């Protein structure tokens, strides 16, 4: 029943859709990789924080980290060009990501594409 090669990689999505999707599920520390919109062969790393924007009744704040792609590698903010998103993401899944302000984005739930129905 739909058994094959699954993963977190989505394909096409906009920072506007992610925030809606990620939140829709309601899973903290949920990251999802999507293709850029106005960037050259680039991607965007969207992660759902376990912290609400307001309080009890508001959606979880998301973090869009511009993902740079150098030919066949990936990086964010720094030069560290991972062999692939699988490594760049995994490394963060254990270590995590640090935002300028200080926020620590953790990736434990590999947001899967999901059967787009409806």
């Amino acid at each position: 029943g739909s058994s094959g090669s699954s993963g977190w990689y989505h394909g096409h999505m906009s920072g506007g859709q992610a925030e809606t999707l990620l939140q829709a599920k309601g899973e903290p520390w949920t990251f999802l990789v999507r293709e850029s919109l106005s960037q050259p062969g680039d991607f965007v790393l969207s992660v759902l924080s376990d912290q609400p924007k307001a309080g009890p009744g508001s959606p979880l704040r998301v973090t869009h980290i511009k993902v740079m792609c150098e030919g066949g590698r990936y990086t964010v903010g720094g030069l560290e060009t991972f062999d692939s998103l699988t490594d760049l993401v995994e490394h963060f899944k254990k270590t995590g990501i640090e935002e300028a302000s200080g926020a620590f984005v953790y990736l434990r739930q590999p947001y899967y594409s999901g059967p787009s129905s409806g």
Partner: peptide, 15 residues
């Protein structure tokens, strides 16, 4: 107008 241009986080590194 009233567009939705989400902002990205400016991670911090050696830089």
């Amino acid at each position: 107008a009233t567009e939705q241009e989400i902002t990205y986080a400016e991670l911090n590194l050696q830089k």
